[PDB]
Amino acid sequence: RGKGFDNVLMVHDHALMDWIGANSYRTSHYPYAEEMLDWADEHGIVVIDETAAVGFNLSLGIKELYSEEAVNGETQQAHLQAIKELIARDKNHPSVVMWSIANEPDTRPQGAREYFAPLAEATRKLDPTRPITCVNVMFCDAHTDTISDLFDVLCLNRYYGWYVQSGDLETAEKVLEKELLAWQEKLHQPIIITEYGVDTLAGLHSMYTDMWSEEYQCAWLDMYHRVFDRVSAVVGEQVWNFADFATSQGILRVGGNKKGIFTRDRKPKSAAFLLQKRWTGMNFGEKPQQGGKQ
Amino acid sequence: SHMLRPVETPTREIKKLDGLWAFSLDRENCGIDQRWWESALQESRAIAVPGSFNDQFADADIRNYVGNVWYQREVFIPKGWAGQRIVLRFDAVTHYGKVWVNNQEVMEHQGGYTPFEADVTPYVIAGKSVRITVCVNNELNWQTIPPGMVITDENGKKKQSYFHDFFNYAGIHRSVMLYTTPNTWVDDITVVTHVAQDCNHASVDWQVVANGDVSVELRDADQQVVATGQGTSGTLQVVNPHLWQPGEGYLYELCVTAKSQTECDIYPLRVGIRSVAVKGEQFLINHKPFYFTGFGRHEDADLRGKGFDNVLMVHDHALMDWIGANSYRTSHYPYAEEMLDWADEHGIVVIDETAAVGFNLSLGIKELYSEEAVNGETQQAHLQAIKELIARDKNHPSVVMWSIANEPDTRPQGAREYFAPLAEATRKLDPTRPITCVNVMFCDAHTDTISDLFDVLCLNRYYGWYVQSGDLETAEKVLEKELLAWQEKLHQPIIITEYGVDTLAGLHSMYTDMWSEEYQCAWLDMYHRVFDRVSAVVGEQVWNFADFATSQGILRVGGNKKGIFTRDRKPKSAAFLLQKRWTGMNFGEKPQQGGKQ
Amino acid sequence: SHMLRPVETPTREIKKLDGLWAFSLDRENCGIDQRWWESALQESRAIAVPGSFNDQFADADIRNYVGNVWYQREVFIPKGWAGQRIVLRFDAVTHYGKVWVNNQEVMEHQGGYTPFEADVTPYVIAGKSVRITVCVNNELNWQTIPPGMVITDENGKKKQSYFHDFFNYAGIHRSVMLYTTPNTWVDDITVVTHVAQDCNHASVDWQVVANGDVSVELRDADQQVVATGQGTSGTLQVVNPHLWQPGEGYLYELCVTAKSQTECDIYPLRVGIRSVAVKGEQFLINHKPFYFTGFGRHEDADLRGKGFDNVLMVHDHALMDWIGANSYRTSHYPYAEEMLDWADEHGIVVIDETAAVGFNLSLGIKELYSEEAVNGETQQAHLQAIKELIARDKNHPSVVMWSIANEPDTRPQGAREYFAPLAEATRKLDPTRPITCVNVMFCDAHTDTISDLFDVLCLNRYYGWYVQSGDLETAEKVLEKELLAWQEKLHQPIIITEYGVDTLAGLHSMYTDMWSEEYQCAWLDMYHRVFDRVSAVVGEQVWNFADFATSQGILRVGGNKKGIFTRDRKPKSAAFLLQKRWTGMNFGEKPQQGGKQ
């Protein structure tokens, strides 16, 4: 039963998270049901509410389609009502600490700053108790006409040696920090990476830490780690997918896309074993040592 | 310039391929500087030859390394080679190799997949140990074949990029041997075997000698003689029905004798009497329509990369045999000796290609005009690549066509300027076989180049995978209407040289979806449906014998899974599908109309 | 009849382990008296050597077949050889090979993991070609090493049944040369080095009964003659020595020299200053107490099983290197030439075993013979097995034991009695290197035969595997109190030779279940803690290196997944433990048995 509710799945996944040391997650690319109230509350799990606001590009084959004559008034107003309906529901829930208003929104073409800011300014008027956010794509340089200013914690989710720099970990780190440094200054606000990951086929090992192997995901993941906790600005790290999950038709994606730390049936990849040493060898809720004595 | 295959006779050959050699990485570019070929190879570990070197060591920085590498070997010249012409050849060294036999440089080569042999006695006296050093380079540029493009990092860090699919494995892939002939020796031969309405005839013979008087006799299926021949470079011999055919491989045995006043040289050459012609949208072999069924393949195995190994060749052919495959195309470069070996004895019909993939800037999934980065210079290298392959494969009856390139972009302006000469050039080199140039997806929007300047249409169709994702009925519609387009337009025979989908090995779905065995099957069955209803389709070659390693990228699951067989030769469900279809097919004859409503 | 594995100089040889001998099976029998060795081979098929005949043709009816197989190759004998003799060598034909040359029995053998030796130039011409027929026998019986029983099924379905894990891969698994040598020739050498913490002084001795006179030049590395004494047997000296170490394996080269008025022969054989003996309950070489770190191995590869590959060797060895194992047992049979090459050069310490395995009816985990077989003709054969095996590796610096048999049954009937005399024979064939034997799961003051006679008890078990299934904590309880038990009884050094689990390569789970990656890992280091916590334990060697093929049954799946690596060398998460643990040791020394708290 995809996208459907199960008491078991909730008791179990939550047990996974518990074990593996994650205190948080975004309901991603839509609102969930009632894991909110139950789990996050009771166990103090901090959630970053998102909206089913996703897929505002023609920009990633990785035709034609409409270019901002749609994604217009009737759609902004609908986007309005989406944020209405979503604050209606979780405005009490102690586990809600943000409102992500949209994921991966395109910020360059045409009339972007203009559609968007009024919605920052409406939601604001519906909750000022919890700061609002928005989730960035891979365009960066002093960059968004719309996202930069209006939001309180920039949430940036990328794959810096994945669809470009394929498997070059060392340069991808170079590019990673100098661009966190870049993102650091511009806004002098707190930065949370919301989708960091790789695609890894559950049962694949190899000596050369190849792409799509267990030992790549592991090497790759902790490449991030080092430049992560080495930047004052970074305050949130959230690995992109929990489990493999189904995806639309195409190539790039296989049986879903194998982007989970766990598999669809919750069997754990070797990456679950990193993120449980790292993630519990922290003190509760506090940045690790950004350097250890030498 | 001009060679023949070392066969053992009053010629003898010593195999020098124990491939226990001393390997070093010339990590900074100094091997040649510090004259490394003239002393003990420092830091030199043990490596196998024949074999690629990328995979042997389970080491990442050796795999994706890009400069230069050395091969050092202590070897022993036979006593008995007294006043003998002693030549040293390498059946292949992949992108570059110069050979120092004890501080004498004797040979260097460019073609990555063809032989190069240099030498007479002068540089070695019999009965003592020589130290052979090979410099192998693995760089591709715009004049190389394949083409390539190398990115240098901010810091003399060299990172090779290319435009083909399969991993750029480099090293001595094939056998290296020291071999000897007397001072009279047949240097080259050429045979052309005509047949007429099947009961009949002619076996043309041409010749070139190293100061000798060639006598020729074409002798045996049973060892008894059956024709005799005149002198240097002349003949036509004539007899009865015994032929070489797709089904069996039946081959005669023509030997060449040269004669100076004292010295002698007898070389034997196997001869398949077969007719190969294309007449009006039919590919005739011994004058009857033939139907290709088979594989595009690669020279790719599990630890040896592109290295050559007998066992695989024996196994893979048991698998091609079982599946009912009658043909294959050497998918992207010349293959080694599976030509005579096994393609000739069992009359497997081969399409052999040159090393030319990636003349395309479009297939991603720095740049801008596919010309004056493709030169009259590359054109030259290309012509050279061709020249060296026809050279070696000229006589193999297995080979029934030449493919001079794979999937070049023929939209740009010079495409036709570039191929037309290469087209006319390969025909003047061997008129006996049709030529072809394997097609990417283009049909009226296929453009200038030379489907028309070629003899039989080979089309690569890895379709739904990319264009109509996972859709069958829309995919069937365009396939058939495109295939027809190519009929009306060129009226030549059409071979589908690539058709299939990446399929994870054990991934089953009740919704046949992408990467599921169930899917591979439907997709393959769809194709067949439409082949079977388009007359000009005279052959199907499924894209891929087995999962083979690839270059970098997302569409690339480690060793992207293009195969029917796994890289460890295990059958995906799709194999049994082809077993039924192909062996259900009475041999070599296209099905009459394949389904019917 | 003992031998020396060829090398060259004015001994030369022609690798003729070429590919593609002709191949036929003998069913409805009839081969040996239908004079098949001439008039050659109707209806054969191509086969390659060296390798198995089993997996090559991807066929069950060949794979499982038992009985006689025919193998036939032609070869030109080199001119410039008419002077010397023409010795033909197979480095093994698996169970039984009856060589012929043009029409007459040339050699015969039953070993199977050891060499043959025959023709000294007398049978046919020094300058022409001569067909070489071989007949190979798969079958095993109780007087055969790897004993088994063949049951001819009703109307002749002759199935073979055996008593060990690995599959009954047969045929010419190894390199089949032929060689040259002058009529005075060295032959049958013997060397060995006794040392103190300071020096020195290895031994000259050998059977050159052929026309030769005596000369012995020993070299260090790099062509410096040092300390040479010239009479067939007089010991030598060291000014001060650079001694054979497991880290480095520095070895000397002494060129035996047999002088004559007619054609004197010089031979190169290298040698290493190995200090091999036991002292109390500790294992010392160059007089230090070091640790064994390896796997049990097998000669099993994906397409040519039990057959030789230069690549596989360069690669596997690279794996071991990376993963921190300095040792291994050739398991359940002798190998080929990884001995000399790798172990020597890299100082890898090997524990030679014999194809002595499967001496029980005792583990379904019928009837069969109970010690009326496994008798005299079989002990004598077991005798000859130890003969043939010491013949070969008595020089090899990497040989530090002789395991005489694996998993031998020690309780039923007449065990102490068959066995001790073989401890007492081998002793008489080498006292330079201590002998051993490998235990099964019966323990309590236990073996009638094994306990006393051997120098380092070698015990390989699975203490929470086929019993105590997955109970790690009690299995540890039981593990130590039984190492304690094994500790005292014999006050000798104890090496565990097969410790492992079965793990399906791609299986993870939260509950460290059986057959998961994270069980093998948890399980393996459960051993680890009780291991290095027992003074007595000096050797740990994980059972299998890679998955490998096994006989028919249930308990075992695709082999049995008992390797740290998979058959195609892809590494399980256990390779990642045994490489942290195994390199976070100091070279060759027991870890801290406790770390401060």
| DSSP code per residue over C178-223 | EEEE-SS---SB-------SS-------B---SS-EEEEEEEETTT
Task: Give the side-chain half-sphere CA count within 13 A for C268.
Answer: 13
The answer to whether the CB of B530 falls within 8 A of the CB of B483 is: yes
d(CA C126, CA C178): 13
d(CA B588, CA B325): 10
SS3 of residue B574 by DSSP: helix
Find which of C169, C302, C507 to mutate to test the B interface (most B CBs within 10 Å of its CB). Answer: C302
Taking contacts as CB-CB distances below 8 angstroms, the residues of chain C near B567 are 568
Specify the residue for token string 């290469």. Answer: B422
d(CA A82, CA A105): 16
**Cβ contacts of B565 within 8 Å, gap of 6 or more:** B319, B545, B546, B547, B571, B572, B575
Q: Compute CA distances B114 → B91, B313, C490, whole Å.
A: 6, 18, 64
Task: Give yes or no: C407 in active site.
Answer: yes
Which residue in B78, B80, B304 is closest to C311 by CB distance?
B304
Task: Give the side-chain half-sphere CA count within 13 A for C368.
Answer: 21
Sign of CA dihedral C459, C465, C466, C470: positive
d(CA C496, CA C480): 13
Instruction: Describe the crossing of helices C517-531 and C573-580 by its angle, rounded to 10 degrees.
Output: 20
Taking contacts as CB-CB distances below 8 angstroms, the residues of chain B near C129 are 8
Catalytic residue among C407, C476, C517, C540: C407
Q: Which two tokens stand for residue A289?
A: 């040592």
Q: Compute CA distances C453 → C136, C404, C408, C437, whole Å.
A: 37, 12, 14, 9
d(CA B55, CA B53): 6
d(CA C15, CA C513): 50
The answer to whether the CB of B137 falls within 8 A of the CB of B68 is: yes
d(CA B17, CA A211): 34
What is the experimental resolution, given in Å to one decimal place? 2.9
Cα C477 vs. chain centroid, distance in angstroms? 34
Instruction: Describe the crossing of helices A270-277 and A214-228 by its angle, rounded to 10 degrees.
Output: 20
Closest approach of chain A CAs to the CA of B157, in angstroms? Answer: 12
Amino acid (one-letter) located at B582: W
Closest approach of chain C CAs to the CA of B276, in angstroms? Answer: 27
The answer to whether the CB of C461 falls within 8 A of the CB of C483 is: no
Catalytic residue among B353, B407, B517, B540: B407
**Cβ contacts of C387 within 8 Å, gap of 6 or more:** C429
Instruction: Describe the crossing of helices C517-531 and C472-490 by its angle, rounded to 10 degrees.
Output: 40
The 10 Å CB-count burial string (b at 16+, else e) for C358-392 is bbbeeeeeeeeeeeeebeeebbebbeebbbbbbbb
Taking contacts as CB-CB distances below 8 angstroms, the residues of chain B near C314 are 46-48, 56-57
Q: Would you call C505 and A205 a contact, using CB atoms and an 8 Å cutoff?
A: yes
The answer to whether the CB of B253 falls within 8 A of the CB of B246 is: no
DSSP, res B594: S
The answer to whether the CB of B482 falls within 8 A of the CB of B460 is: no
Q: Would you call C505 and A269 a contact, using CB atoms and an 8 Å cutoff?
A: no
d(CA A116, CA A107): 9
The 10 Å CB-count burial string (b at 16+, else e) for A211-241 is bbbbbbbbebbebbbebbbebebbebbbbbb
Q: Would you call C81 and B80 a contact, using CB atoms and an 8 Å cutoff?
A: yes
Q: Binding residue per annotation — B15?
A: no
Q: Binding residue per annotation — A23?
A: no
CATH-assigned architecture of domain C276-597: Alpha-Beta Barrel (3.20)
Q: Residue C227: left (phi > 0), alpha (psi -120 to 50), or beta?
A: left
SS3 of residue C449 by DSSP: coil
Which residue in A167, A199, A250 is closest to B552 by CB distance?
A167
The answer to whether the CB of C464 falls within 8 A of the CB of C514 is: no
Every domain of chain B and the residues it spans: 1-182, 183-275, 276-597
The answer to whether the CB of B294 falls within 8 A of the CB of B564 is: no
Q: Compute CA distances A159 → A166, A167, A173, A219, B554, whole Å.
A: 10, 10, 11, 14, 12
The answer to whether the CB of C327 falls within 8 A of the CB of C497 is: no
SS3 of residue A47 by DSSP: strand
- Please enumerate, by residue number, every residue of C annotated as part of a binding site: 165, 406, 460, 466, 498, 543, 562
The answer to whether the CB of C87 falls within 8 A of the CB of C179 is: yes
Closest approach of chain C CAs to the CA of B9, in angstroms? Answer: 7
Q: Which two tokens stand for residue C500?
A: 């492992």
Q: Which two tokens stand for residue A17?
A: 């998270």
The answer to whether the CB of B527 falls within 8 A of the CB of B590 is: no
Task: Give the side-chain half-sphere CA count within 13 A for A155.
Answer: 26
Domain B1-182 and domain B276-597 have a common topology: no
Sign of CA dihedral C313, C318, C319, C320: positive
Q: Which residues in chain C precede a discontinuity of more than 2.5 Å between C and N?
A: 365
Three-state secondary structure readout of B143-184 = CCCCCEEEEECCCCCEEEEECCCECCCCCCCCCEEEEEECCC
SS3 of residue A93 by DSSP: coil
Q: Would you call B507 and A255 a contact, using CB atoms and an 8 Å cutoff?
A: yes
**Cβ contacts of A74 within 8 Å, gap of 6 or more:** none
Q: Which DSSP string corresponds to C364-382? A: -------SSSSSHHHHHHH
Which residues of C463-519 form beta strands (DSSP E)? Answer: 494-499
- For chain C, the first-to-last Cα distance in angstroms comes to 61
Specify the residue for token string 């435009």. Answer: B163
Q: Would you call C506 and A269 a contact, using CB atoms and an 8 Å cutoff?
A: no
Closest among B539, B533, B525 to B573, alpha carbons compared: B525
Which residue in A202, A205, A268 is closest to C572 by CB distance?
A205
Taking contacts as CB-CB distances below 8 angstroms, the residues of chain A near C519 are none
DSSP, res B374: S
d(CA C423, CA C419): 7
Q: Which two tokens stand for residue A247?
A: 């995806």
Find which of B173, B267, B311 to mutate to test the C interface (most C CBs within 10 Å of its CB). Answer: B311
Q: Is the peptide bond before C200 cis (omega within 30 degrees of 0)?
A: yes
**CA dihedral of B502, B508, B514, B515, whole degrees rounded to 10:** -20
How are strands ordered across the β-sheet holding B105-109?
Answer: B45-47, B21-25, B68-76, B129-137, B96-101, B105-109
DSSP, res B570: P
Q: What are phi and psi of C515, to 5 degrees?
A: 70, 15
Q: Which two tokens stand for residue B48?
A: 């196998």
Closest approach of chain A CAs to the CA of B515, in angstroms? Answer: 7
**CA dihedral of C395, C400, C406, C408, whole degrees rounded to 10:** 110
The answer to whether the CB of B367 falls within 8 A of the CB of B201 is: no
d(CA B565, CA B295): 11
Q: Is the peptide bond before B146 cis (omega within 30 degrees of 0)?
A: yes
Which homologous superfamily does the CATH classification assign to the domain defined by C1-182?
Galactose-binding domain-like (2.60.120.260)
| H or E stretch at C425 | helix C415-426
| H or E stretch at B136 | strand B129-137
Interface of C with A (CB under 8 A): 322, 505-510, 517, 569-573
Amino acid (one-letter) located at B224: Q
Q: Binding residue per annotation — B543?
A: yes
User: Can you give the C-alpha Rg of chain A in angstroms?
Assistant: 19
Q: Is the peptide bond before B421 cis (omega within 30 degrees of 0)?
A: no
In this structure, the number of other CB atoms found within 10 A of the CB of residue B227 comes to 17
Q: Residue C254: left (phi > 0), alpha (psi -120 to 50), or beta?
A: beta
User: Can you give the C-alpha Rg of chain C in angstroms?
Assistant: 25
Closest approach of chain A CAs to the CA of B519, in angstroms? Answer: 12
**Cβ contacts of C499 within 8 Å, gap of 6 or more:** C460, C461, C462, C524, C527, C540, C541, C542, C543
d(CA A274, CA A219): 10
Q: Which two tokens stand for residue B243?
A: 């032929």
**Cβ contacts of C249 within 8 Å, gap of 6 or more:** C272, C343, C344, C345, C346, C347, C348, C397, C398
Closest among B251, B274, B257, B268 to B202, alpha carbons compared: B274
Task: Give the CATH fold of the A1-294 domain.
Answer: TIM Barrel (3.20.20)
Q: Compute CA distances B508 → B209, B379, B504, B517, whole Å.
A: 61, 47, 9, 6
Q: Would you call A207 and B59 a contact, using CB atoms and an 8 Å cutoff?
A: yes
Catalytic residue among B281, B353, B482, B498: B498
Q: Which two tokens stand for residue B223?
A: 């060892």
As to burial, measured by CB atoms within 10 angstroms (0-12 exposed, 13-18 middle, 19+ buried), residue C147 is: buried
The answer to whether the CB of B156 falls within 8 A of the CB of B97 is: no
d(CA B482, CA B446): 11
SS3 of residue B421 by DSSP: helix
Which residue in C505, C508, C572 is closest to A267 by CB distance?
C508
**CA dihedral of A10, A11, A12, A18, whole degrees rounded to 10:** 100
Amino acid (one-letter) located at B214: V
Q: What angle do CA C249, C334, C448 make, to 5 degrees?
A: 105
d(CA B438, CA B355): 12
Q: Which two tokens stand for residue B224?
A: 């008894």
d(CA A75, CA A115): 10
**CA dihedral of A217, A223, A228, A229, whole degrees rounded to 10:** 110
Q: What angle do CA B441, B447, B452 make, to 5 degrees?
A: 100
Sign of CA dihedral B51, B56, B61, B64: positive
Taking contacts as CB-CB distances below 8 angstroms, the residues of chain C near A204 are 506
Closest among C552, C551, C553, C542 to C576, alpha carbons compared: C542
**CA dihedral of B499, B505, B511, B513, whole degrees rounded to 10:** -40
Return the bridge partners of B436, or none: B403
The answer to whether the CB of C21 falls within 8 A of the CB of C47 is: yes
Q: Which two tokens stand for residue C16?
A: 């003729």
SS3 of residue C532 by DSSP: coil
Q: Would you call A205 and C510 a contact, using CB atoms and an 8 Å cutoff?
A: no
As to burial, measured by CB atoms within 10 angstroms (0-12 exposed, 13-18 middle, 19+ buried), residue A258 is: buried
Sign of CA dihedral B333, B336, B340, B341: negative
Closest among B512, B511, B498, B509 to B564, alpha carbons compared: B498
- For chain B, the first-to-last Cα distance in angstroms comes to 58
Closest approach of chain C CAs to the CA of B544, in angstroms? Answer: 18
| H or E stretch at B437 | strand B435-438
d(CA A126, CA A86): 10
Find which of A165, A201, A210 to mutate to test the B interface (most B CBs within 10 Å of its CB). Answer: A210
Return the bridge partners of B353, or none: B403
d(CA B191, CA A291): 75
The answer to whether the CB of B404 falls within 8 A of the CB of B356 is: yes
Q: Compute CA distances B513 → A244, B212, B502, C329, C547, whole Å.
A: 16, 66, 11, 48, 32
SS3 of residue C286 by DSSP: coil
Amino acid (one-letter) located at A169: L
d(CA C199, CA C240): 6
- Number of DSSP helices (H) and strands (E) in chain C, helices first: 9, 28
d(CA A235, CA A133): 14
Taking contacts as CB-CB distances below 8 angstroms, the residues of chain C near A205 are 505, 570-573
Looking at chain B, which subunits does it touch, using at least 3 CB pairs closer than 8 Å as the criterion? A, C
Taking contacts as CB-CB distances below 8 angstroms, the residues of chain B near A254 are 504, 514-515, 557
Q: Which residues of A are catalytic?
A: 104, 195
Which residue in C46, C315, C569 is closest to B314 by CB distance?
C46
CATH class of B183-275: mainly beta
Closest among B255, B251, B248, B179 to B214, alpha carbons compared: B255
d(CA B116, CA B176): 10
User: Can you give the C-alpha Rg of chain B in angstroms?
Assistant: 24
Q: Would you call C569 and B58 a contact, using CB atoms and an 8 Å cutoff?
A: yes
Taking contacts as CB-CB distances below 8 angstroms, the residues of chain A near C506 are 202-204
DSSP, res B43: T
Amino acid (one-letter) located at B237: Q
The answer to whether the CB of A95 falls within 8 A of the CB of A41 is: yes
Task: Give the side-chain half-sphere CA count within 13 A for B408.
Answer: 30
Interface of C with B (CB under 8 A): 8-10, 12, 14-15, 18-20, 46-48, 51, 55-59, 75-76, 78-81, 129, 302-304, 307, 309-315, 318-319, 322, 341-342, 345, 567-569
d(CA C270, CA C282): 28
Taking contacts as CB-CB distances below 8 angstroms, the residues of chain B near C9 are 76
